[PDB]
Design a binder for this molecule. Structure first.
Ligand SMILES: [Mg+2]
Ligand SMILES: [Mg+2]
Ligand SMILES: [Mg+2]
Ligand SMILES: [Mg+2]
Ligand SMILES: [Mg+2]
Ligand SMILES: [Mg+2]
Ligand SMILES: [Mg+2]
Ligand SMILES: [Mg+2]
Lengths: 173, 103, 173, 173, 173, 173, 173, 173, 173
């Protein structure tokens, strides 16, 4: 599982592999680890039991309105219960949420991670690899936020033995 | 090239004097010598560098044919030029694939 | 325990071994790991304490009506509580549910697994093996959804030292 | 890694993937795991640890050169070296070797084992998978030997995360 | 594996299953675990690790050839080699050997042990099972020796997941 | 540590960080992990344990001096020493060596491995990171070889806590 | 993560690195581990899931008023529930709180730590190092409470492979 | 134990605590961990296990006597003995040695390492502490070398429970 | 076991309990753990494992006989044998030896250590206890040496479950 979120020149893209795996065997490869939410306004990928995701991206929907759309808030508030609630600590995963202005990574254990002066996010076992490729690209090439994620995932999958080729990207809007 | 002709009793000086026993007259051509030498240096580099003894190889791997049939050539003279040399020394032997050990 | 669900040319079949085992000894071999439900409309096999199964295939019956028969839903909703409820996380098993349209595998830990362009499902320790045989067969042979599962299980059992011969198949309808 | 071999109608095929996995990452996708021995008249395929597999292979090679290539013999000889009295390094790997005569797998612990009857052999982490596949195919399809192998490996790779798609199938006219 | 031997009315039977289990999978169902020694006048059956069992067997074979086949002696001799001073490899396996004279099991750690009185011996993971069976039968049925063995193994196989049904019963006229 | 090497357009670059990490602390930030061999015509870079890396390097050095510097050969030779019969110390480290001819990494367990095609090699804890970076760059930018390397290492260091910024890039005219 | 609080000649300073880390990889380096609270009257840094922090620095705000601003109290009272509450023991971290008069370190496990006749505090993995530098400095040099923390953190980061350069200091007022 | 050495203005100081800790108790508080070698012209300080530290020291002593006391050389020589081919005992300890020429620490695993530039070296459990202290001081105070050392050790002892106050500071006119 | 020795006013006393503890049971309460050496002019007391303690003692005995009984020397010699090059058995035990000259404890790992100044030494599981006692007494009571020892052991035995009351106090006129 490798998820990566790029942001360059007006475009906010998030996309990743689709390889569910049990130990050292493949269980599904067509999966979607990137989904849209909040009336197709906020797109976000995951890395864990896809269910754990929904039960989270659902607690995010609600916990987003209350604070009036302000993304970061909805998040900071989310990691505030993910650790205090004894029915969430059991939902280990990683999360990436992004919209028009910024982008953010949510954590079940630690706490929210705001991007660098490069605006790039990555999670999953194959993460950093993807990140390693992306960063580079958005530093020398003039590629598309969607021409980078693209290539970046390729670079991941071809290394992490848990990340593959069938990725699903989601530009905006 | 130099060891090949210059010294006293150089390789060429020797094979020449020997064939002269069967009643044969051989003549080494500069251009040939040059090749014999390029040859030696080659294999020494490409395989196991044994110094100058290598000339004693390329030399014998070349003079094989004449060395044998030279008895039945009394009277003739033989000219060892490039085209000759080039044809007594194949090019490279054995697949020499050192890959069967690599991953 | 090996369960496999095939789908080919109008037929939806599910069948598997019947070897309950305690550590490295056999405790029962005539068992039924494939059962019919919802008024004989939905058939489904399991892989775990058969009880854990019923207490699950019972929570599925109800959680299926609410969403109006739509199989996938009843499932996605099921794995939604299997992880949030502290009285279900203790029910470790694997599940396969299928009906007229599609077929699906349920997970206690991860999340629902939708088949490939081949429509094949498999769980249990001997799973993949069965899967390995099936897939192949439904790719070259013109065998029956019931002539495949058949042979597939044979191929499993003869390898997994926990899967045997007394399988129970369930075609539809 | 996955290495399987099938033998039918004067044909002997031994082929395998090409993935070298360091921990949970990929060293190199292209790797020749099946190779030719004895002037190219006996087929070989090694599994396990790169180091110990290669050192197993080489040792089997010396034996052949020392026994007019007579496979079976050569094997039992090598095996003997582990059964003598001074426990050799005990290489952790496995080899599948065969030629015009017979097929045979050899562990680096000290034994030579023969195929059931379906003349199907398969070592590696993906073996059993490719096995099942072939064990199936063979029983239900007049597919060639150089064909079953090709498809069985693939079936595996799509299952074992340590088994890729860059195969190498050495057959024996 | 299961290897049991019963001795009654001038008859000595030593038979066992034929399953080679690699981890929790099956290498080969047909395997001769009981064999003949000394021109074919002394029966043998090995258990444990394929490698170490075979290397145990072979060592017992040299002794016989060196002691006019006199079983008992041959055994104590071999045993001695472990009791000398330089701890030999210490093979992890077990052998059940017998002939017209007596029955005897030998561990690869250094000892020779004799049967209670019912002249019943059984090693392997299924042993005790087959044991119980025979230990019973014998006490309550004039069943032959070549008969008790046959049924006892089977009783085991239906219990030990590492013990199959393809037996091999070598008796001694 | 991170050691990566890229080869393109007659250029061969092998460079790495300079951090020596004792447990979770820093011994020294400046360290030359890439050095020159054979009168300075073949490049080297070692990874792993300071002790075993150095002792690996030295052993590769003797071979060169003994084989007219012919890299490839020299390697397979050294590798051989581990495959002989008496298992050598088995140094836990890795070396990336190259010259005007080819690139090649050598483990201290006994093997020599070659690059995919992108002529990209990278060992160390940060390797894969620098790898991804370069594996990317190369595929999308006419950046020099002595340039890709420089940027890839950096990308790593900003990711691997055991990889710093004090690089050393030895190229080969 | 390294946090250090100094107090010298009328100034109360607290500042630390900004390196969030997952195992042995960097996840964020621009983070703020020092924050102001209680109407910018009390500043305090942390060392743990930044969230865990807020959910703590929030329970401190309230638990501070009740006792009428008296810092130490608000703290002693805080560690009184951090251990009795089964929803706080799950919030492992370290904390430093300081204001006009004194400065204090809070603990999730142990209990409040009052400074020495030097008025210096330190937490995080790189702590003591920072402390080691600070103490020294505030014992010989006449540096600023802000010229010390400064240099002290530098000294930490350059040793702890989890502490870096992007620190955020907070003097008062 | 803590052993630190600083070198500035023709002065070389190597001093350390004196505590011998058996498990969590104290063997003896007074212990000379820094001593003189080669007629008393080269300084030494050992860390780690009493046994292996002493046996490391002694071995470094033989080398000196054998190489006109030329430090650096002597070191690399000793180091070599571990890199040869027959892995020596591998003493678990560390030595900090220096004289009028240079400073150098030597592990008992097989390496010699040099100081950054601040000519500061420190081994032992308290090392890094004393390090930080000195690494600081030096950068901000014209304190002597025989002075920094004295204060740095102390700073450590007040931190490391295995480092006491009975120092021994051997300097080199 | 507890073995303590005190030295004051020309008197040297070394005495200890007599309990041999096998696991958590008692082998024999009466055991002489302190004995006489060199014609009976040097005192000895061993701790640790019966086997290794005795084998340590004996080795110290050979040395004495070989060095005109000169204690100190004899010790350093023995110690040397562990520091040579071929790591000896490494006995897990400890000895407290003394005579008219000095006191000295010797570990079986390779070192000789001297008393603080209070000339108090104590090894064994109860040592530190008896130590504390004596370390006290001595500092506050003109109690004899053959007296402090007697009371200190007892204080221990009433604390260490592996230290009984059947003492043996060998003094040295
Ligand atoms: Mg992959
Ligand atoms: Mg089975
Ligand atoms: Mg795969
Ligand atoms: Mg069975
Ligand atoms: Mg770093
Ligand atoms: Mg750091
Ligand atoms: Mg202390
Ligand atoms: Mg007691």
């Amino acid at each position: 599982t490798t998820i990566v979120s790029v942001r360059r020149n007006g475009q906010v893209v998030v996309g990743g592999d689709g390889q569910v795996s049990l130990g050292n065997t493949v269980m599904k490869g067509n999966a979607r680890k990137v989904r849209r939410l909040y009336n197709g306004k906020v797109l976000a990928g995951f890395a864990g039991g896809t269910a754990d995701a929904f039960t989270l991206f659902e607690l995010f929907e609600r916990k987003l309105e209350m604070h009036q759309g302000h993304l970061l808030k909805s998040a900071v508030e989310l990691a505030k219960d993910w650790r205090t609630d004894r029915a969430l600590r059991k939902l280990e995963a990683m999360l990436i949420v992004a919209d028009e202005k910024e982008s953010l990574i949510i954590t079940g254990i630690g706490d929210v991670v705001q991007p660098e002066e490069d605006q790039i996010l990555a999670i999953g076992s194959g993460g950093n690899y993807a990140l390693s490729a992306a960063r580079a690209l958005v530093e020398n090439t003039e590629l598309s936020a969607h021409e980078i994620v693209e290539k970046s995932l390729r670079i991941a999958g071809d290394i992490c033995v848990f990340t593959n080729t069938n990725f699903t990207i989601e530009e905006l809007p | 090239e130099r060891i090949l002709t210059e010294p006293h009793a150089s390789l060429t000086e020797q094979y020449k004097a020997l064939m002269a026993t069967e009643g044969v007259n051989i003549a080494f051509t500069t251009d040939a010598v040059k090749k014999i030498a390029e040859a030696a240096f080659r294999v020494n580099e490409k395989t196991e560098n044994i110094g100058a003894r290598r000339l004693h190889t390329v030399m014998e791997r070349l003079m094989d044919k004449i060395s044998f049939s030279a008895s039945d050539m009394n009277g003739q003279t033989v000219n060892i030029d490039a085209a000759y040399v080039a044809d007594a020394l194949g090019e490279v032997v054995e697949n020499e694939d050192l890959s069967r050990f690599i991953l």
